[PDB]
Every structure is written in C-alpha cells, then in structure tokens.
C-alpha cells in the first residue's frame, strides 16, 4: 500500500548522457548507438538566439566544432545533421551502454520521467506529464537543455521528450527525439505564451481509483452521472472533456474496485463543486492529474 509519484529507474538513461559543446555553448546530449542527439541551439551564441537562422548558422560548423564528452573521455564526431530542432552527431563509437529503445511522440496527458542533467551528468529524476497546452512543469536550470523524458517497458526505453526551453512564465517546452516541438513553440528567444493549462480528467479519475485502492474513500458519493452531464461540469472547471476512450482505459480500475466509471465521475463532479473542505486524498489537498490509468495499474500491481 501507499501511493507515490514514482519515476522509472533512471540507470538505462544515465548510461546515455553526454556533454555536447559547440564553441562556448554547452548542453546535454543523448548517445544511442553511434549517434548523439542534442538541441540544435548548441550551435548558437547568446546574440544568435534572438532570431536564429539555424540552417545558416550550421554552415559555419564542421564535425570538429562539436565536442562530445562521455564521462571524462572524448568521442570522435564523424558526421552531423539537423533533423527539425535536434542535431544528430554521428560518432565513431557505438555507446556500449545503449539500451533497447524507441523514439515515441506522446499525447497530452501522458506521463513520463525526466532525468535532469547538467554538463552531461545526471542530477535527479522526477515524474511529470505532457500538459494539455503542450508544456511540462519540470525543474530545469541553465545547462539542463538536452535532458530527456522517457518511459520504460520491461527492458525497452521509449524516449519521448528532449528539453529545449523555458517560457517566460517558468513552464517548459521541448521536442520529441525527432526534433519536433510539442505544441506551437519555437527555439527562439521571443516571448511565447502558453494556452490554458487544463486538468487531465482521465488521470484525476485514475488517481481517485488509486486512492480507493489504498483506503482513502471519504469522497465516494451516492451519485452517478452521464458523460454529457459530467462534461458540462468539466468545462466549467477547466478539466479536459472525458471521452468513451478514457472510460475504456479506466475499465480495469473500475473492475478492481467495483466502482463504475460514471459513478467515479459523479464523485469527482461533487469534489469540483464542493471542494475538499480541508481534507486530503493520498496526502494531497488538490486533485492530482499526473498519474495515467496505466501508471495506477502499474504501481498498484508492482510491474518491474
């Protein structure tokens, strides 16, 4: 029992972190096989970041201008290319610690772990979610660009995020491992505002199921609702609309607890309308939305 915000074990990703330096700019890179992936803004000077033309700036860079250091040893760069907002640096040595991996582009509401790194060295690991406005609420200081987000399925690491930027409001933006930004963000120092950060409804419901499984049941009410009635309330409270696909995904949690999905929706509707009244659920005084239904099943069953 007990329910914690849990990150994946980070070892498989730690073995991939390298430092990439171009000129006087240093950030993190991800070394998989004989390729090092890093944010393309490693080629920029501070002055270039106001309005960079990456294709033009890249012309002034050769293989020998990219310094890649894995631990305290230098990797030889034998090729380089730009794919969207990431640079792929071909090195002469395959990473001996390369885990089985995939590159995946996640949808909003999906969670993942971030291994925050500085100078190619891991500092910590935390769990977060792709917000519905395509930002993440991370913990990133200068030098953390190139840190990655991932999920693990047994022995395969699915990389889903690479850190690029902080918006002026302190929220974070980045790309998938193909270099495509999540959301409308661009790698340029121009003020970019985020859209509404709505609450991930299917994740709140999953966490209410986790709470029932662990014995926090005070919020269970005597009501039910429909998807349409619930969604009227969800819209009022800036919660994402609940679809039958979300209901389907909650099926195993509904089966384990015996609480119909629409009954849990009605309990969540009452929590939104009445508030918590100074009470807590799983040690939180607000409704947690960074656990997917799969995370709850995984944590409550002990998948390794």
Ligand X SMILES: CC(C)OCCCN(Cc1ccco1)C(=O)Nc1cn(C)c(=O)c2ccccc12
Q: Which residues are catalytic?
A: 41, 145
- Residue 47's binding partner among ligand X, its own copies, none (Cβ under 5 to 8 angstroms by kind) is ligand X
Residue 123 interacting partner from ligand X, its own copies, none (CB closer than 5 to 8 Å by kind): its own copies
3-state secondary structure 71-101: CCEEECEEEEEEECCEEEEEECCCCCCCCEE
Q: Is 283 in the site for its own copies (CB under 8 A)?
A: yes
How deeply is 58 buried, as exposed, middle or buried, from its count of CB atoms within 10 A (0-12, 13-18, 19+)? middle
The site partner of 163 among ligand X, its own copies, none (C-beta below 5 to 8 Å per kind) is none
Site for its own copies in 15-34 (CB under 8 A): 15
221 binds, among its own copies, ligand X, none (CB under 5 to 8 A by kind): none
In the bound state with ligand X, the residue whose beta carbon lies nearer, of 50 and 78, is 50
Pattern 206-245, its own copies, x by CB under 8 A: --------xx------------------------------
**Applying CB under 8 A, which part among 35-43, 46-54, 70-78, 166-174 lies near its own copies?**
166-174
Q: How many CB atoms lie within 10 A of CB 109?
A: 20
Q: Is 180 in the site for its own copies (CB under 8 A)?
A: no
Any residues with CB less than 8 A from the CB of 250 and at least 6 apart, and which? 202, 205, 206, 209, 261, 264, 293
CB 138 within 8 A of CB 145: no
Which stretch, 30-38, 66-74, 98-106, 170-178, contacts its own copies (CB under 8 A)?
170-178
Neighbours of 295 (CB within 10 A): 22
Q: Using alpha carbons, select from 128, 126, 122, 129 the residue that is nearest to residue 144.
A: 122
Considering the rule CB under 8 A, would residue 291 count as an interface residue with its own copies? no
């Amino acid at each position: 029992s007990g329910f914690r915000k849990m990150a994946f074990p980070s070892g498989k990703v730690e073995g991939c972190m390298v430092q990439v330096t171009c000129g006087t700019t240093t950030l993190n890179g991800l070394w998989l096989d004989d390729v090092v992936y890093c944010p393309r803004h490693v080629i920029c000077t501070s002055e270039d970041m106001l309005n960079p033309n990456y294709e033009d700036l890249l012309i002034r860079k050769s293989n020998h201008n990219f310094l890649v250091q894995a631990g305290n040893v230098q990797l030889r760069v034998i090729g380089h290319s730009m794919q969207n907002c990431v640079l792929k640096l071909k090195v002469d040595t395959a990473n001996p610690k390369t885990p089985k991996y995939k590159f995946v582009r996640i949808q909003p509401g999906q969670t993942f772990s971030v291994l925050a790194c500085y100078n190619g060295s891991p500092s910590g690991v935390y769990q977060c979610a792709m917000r519905p406005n395509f930002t993440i609420k991370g913990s990133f200081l200068n030098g953390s660009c190139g840190s990655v987000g991932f999920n693990i399925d047994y022995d395969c690491v699915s990389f889903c995020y690479m850190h690029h930027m902080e918006l002026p409001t302190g929220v974070h933006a980045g790309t998938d491992l193909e270099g495509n930004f999540y959301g409308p963000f661009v790698d340029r120092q121009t003020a970019q505002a985020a859209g509404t950060d709505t609450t991930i409804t299917v994740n709140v419901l999953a966490w209410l199921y986790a709470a029932v499984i662990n014995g926090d049941r005070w919020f269970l009410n005597r009501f039910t609702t429909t998807l349409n009635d619930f969604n009227l309330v969800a819209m009022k409270y800036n919660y994402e609309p609940l679809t039958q696909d979300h209901v389907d995904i909650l099926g195993p949690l509904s089966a384990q607890t015996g609480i119909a999905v629409l009954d849990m929706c009605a309990s969540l509707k009452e929590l939104l309308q009445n508030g918590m009244n100074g009470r807590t659920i799983l040690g939180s005084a607000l409704l947690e939305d960074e656990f997917t239904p799969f995370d709850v099943v995984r944590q409550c069953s002990g998948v390794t």
